[PDB]
Structures are given as structure tokens and as C-alpha cells.
Design a protein around this motif. Sequence first.
Motif, PDB file in Angstrom:
ATOM      1  N   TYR A 118      17.894 102.976  30.377  1.00  5.72           N
ATOM      2  CA  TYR A 118      18.864 101.916  30.237  1.00  5.72           C
ATOM      3  C   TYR A 118      18.351 100.601  30.794  1.00  5.72           C
ATOM      4  O   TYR A 118      17.820 100.536  31.915  1.00  5.72           O
ATOM      5  N   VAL A 119      18.527  99.570  29.974  1.00  3.69           N
ATOM      6  CA  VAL A 119      18.236  98.196  30.330  1.00  3.69           C
ATOM      7  C   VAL A 119      19.501  97.378  30.124  1.00  3.69           C
ATOM      8  O   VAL A 119      20.426  97.783  29.413  1.00  3.69           O
ATOM      9  N   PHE A 120      19.543  96.216  30.747  1.00  2.88           N
ATOM     10  CA  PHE A 120      20.724  95.377  30.667  1.00  2.88           C
ATOM     11  C   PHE A 120      20.320  93.905  30.786  1.00  2.88           C
ATOM     12  O   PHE A 120      19.254  93.599  31.315  1.00  2.88           O
ATOM     13  N   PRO A 121      21.169  92.984  30.299  1.00  4.36           N
ATOM     14  CA  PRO A 121      20.812  91.568  30.410  1.00  4.36           C
ATOM     15  C   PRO A 121      20.734  91.155  31.860  1.00  4.36           C
ATOM     16  O   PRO A 121      21.653  91.424  32.624  1.00  4.36           O
ATOM     17  N   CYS A 122      19.659  90.475  32.236  1.00  5.63           N
ATOM     18  CA  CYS A 122      19.496  90.085  33.624  1.00  5.63           C
ATOM     19  C   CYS A 122      20.610  89.124  34.079  1.00  5.63           C
ATOM     20  O   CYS A 122      20.817  88.950  35.286  1.00  5.63           O
ATOM     21  N   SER A 123      21.303  88.499  33.122  1.00  5.32           N
ATOM     22  CA  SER A 123      22.429  87.626  33.431  1.00  5.32           C
ATOM     23  C   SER A 123      23.716  88.363  33.829  1.00  5.32           C
ATOM     24  O   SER A 123      24.692  87.724  34.211  1.00  5.32           O
ATOM     25  N   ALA A 124      23.734  89.686  33.733  1.00  4.25           N
ATOM     26  CA  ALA A 124      24.935  90.461  34.017  1.00  4.25           C
ATOM     27  C   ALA A 124      25.255  90.540  35.499  1.00  4.25           C
ATOM     28  O   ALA A 124      24.372  90.483  36.349  1.00  4.25           O
ATOM     29  N   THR A 125      26.543  90.681  35.785  1.00  5.41           N
ATOM     30  CA  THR A 125      27.006  91.126  37.087  1.00  5.41           C
ATOM     31  C   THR A 125      27.362  92.606  36.961  1.00  5.41           C
ATOM     32  O   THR A 125      28.250  92.966  36.196  1.00  5.41           O
TER      33      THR A 125
END
Length: 330
Positions: free
Chosen positions: A251-258
Motif C-alpha cells: 500500500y502506497v498513499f499520497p504524501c499530501s494525506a493526513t
Amino acid sequence: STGSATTTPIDSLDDAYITPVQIGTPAQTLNLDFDTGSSDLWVFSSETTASEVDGQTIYTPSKSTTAKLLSGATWSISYGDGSSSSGDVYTDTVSVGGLTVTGQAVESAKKVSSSFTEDSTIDGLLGLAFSTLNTVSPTQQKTFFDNAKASLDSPVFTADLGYHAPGTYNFGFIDTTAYTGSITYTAVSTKQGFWEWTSTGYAVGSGTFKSTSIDGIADTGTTLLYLPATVVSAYWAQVSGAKSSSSVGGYVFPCSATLPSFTFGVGSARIVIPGDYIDFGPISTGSSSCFGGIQSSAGIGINIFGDVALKAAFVVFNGATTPTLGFASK
């Protein structure tokens, strides 16, 4: 007796933690990765293939007046991440945070795999799982904790790992100033040689708690939290844009996420992992895709409460006749 040593993250992501260990006479201090998921104490050494040493501090048994070759003994280990090492064995004096064991098996590496070579900050491992997993042949050897246990004030050690900060391993006592509230103890199975226990469930963020048994191991030598695919999917579904990437390997996620927090159950008690603990940063330098700290255990064959989970708690490894695990918030 007791011992107390500070453990320090190797990098800005808390990929692992190193703890100084004194080996031999005069002391040779090596920085070891304390690993509650394995049972060998092995070190980079003067015997390690030269091309496989790149910046590590080595143990040189010929310079220790208390070192003795354990004649005929060899060892060979492979870890869950595919890394490996092997060699021969000495006995020597080993001290951790003021706690000394004489006659400890110190496994000297002749060969290490590339990931060990490539990590200049880790001089070896100190296993803290059950001695039944120790790989020395033909005579299996005891862990540092197993050797120390009878001398300790109480037959326990504790892990207090920091988030982006140093923490502490204590042997022989519980520091009642190091945690908040009470410690909740839970049953351990030693059948696979691990500190294996059953979590009572989980929650994602501010969501409702799901009561469900999750069998897994408390493993200070694993970076991430590996849980069943159902649980992991439920977590990442709460992060816009998160996805499982076969090319990246999880799993990866946008670095802009909280990121939301993740709660796991210990009996009726709850340990909360803050969202920030689950951020393992860009997948590659400069990328805006970030790697997740909660990943699926599918195809590992076991769930792993690694550092991501353990660092949210004060953790007691109780090595009494019937072992148990304790968790407190901190």
C-alpha cells in the motif's frame, strides 16, 4: 541484577533501532538490532568476507581475552525479509546496559547478505525470541535473555521504542514511570518460538472498534505492522488515493494525506497508533507517493506487530515459567 540501555532509530523513518552492546575483554562495543522475532546473537566480525563489510563495526575475537571458539559450532539464518547470514561461534562476555552475561554465544558472521552489507548502521542482531529458534548446530545456544534470566531481579525485559526518537530496553525490572495507566497482560503461545499473542480487535481513526481475534507476534525486528488483508483494506480505504501497488510491493498513499490513527486491542485495553507513525515517506527520493506503515500479512503466514505497533506502547516481555506479554499506553 538489572540492565538498561538506550535504543536509537537508525534513520529518520525509524526503519530499525540500534542498541550498544559490549562484547569481550576489553569491551568491543557494537550497535545491535534487538530482535524479539529471532534468537541468534550474531555480529559482523574480523571473519566476515571483506567485500561484505561496508562501514560496520566488527567484533575481533582474537583481541578478546575472554573469547573462546565454540568448537565445531556453525550457524545460518534467513529472515522474513529474505536477508541472511552465517558463520561460526565464540563464547564471550556480553553486557547490555550494565547487565553482564558470561559465556554468551556470539555468532561470528563469515557471510552476510547484501541488505546487511548495505546498512552501515547495524553491526549485528541480538535475538530475544525463545531459544528454541536459535540456529546454532550441532548444539543449540541460548539467547542473552535466557542466559541472564535467573540473575535478574524479575524475569522480564521491556521495549519502549520511540517515534522519531530514542527509547529504552530494560532487563529485570519494570520502570513504572515509563508508561501511563496500567499494563494489560495477555497470553503467549511459545509453540512457534515467538512472542505470539492474540489481539482482541481494531479500530480505524475515530471509527467503532471491531472485536475480532488477530493472532500475531510482537517483533521488534520488523519495521511495519502486518495484518490480515481485510483489516489493512479497511484502514487504507479511509485514505483518499491510497492503493495497493504490486510494483512497489504494498500500500502506497499520497504524501499530501493526513493519515488516520489505528487502534489495536489488548484484552479490554486499547493501544492507539497515531497516523503519523504509519507514514514511511516517499517510495523513492522526490516522489509524491508515500509508503504505508500498515501492510498485508497475506503470504507471510503470520501477522506481525512490528515497530509501528510496538512503539505506540510500553511492552513487557514476561519470561516467567508461563510467559506473557504486557502492553501499556505511554
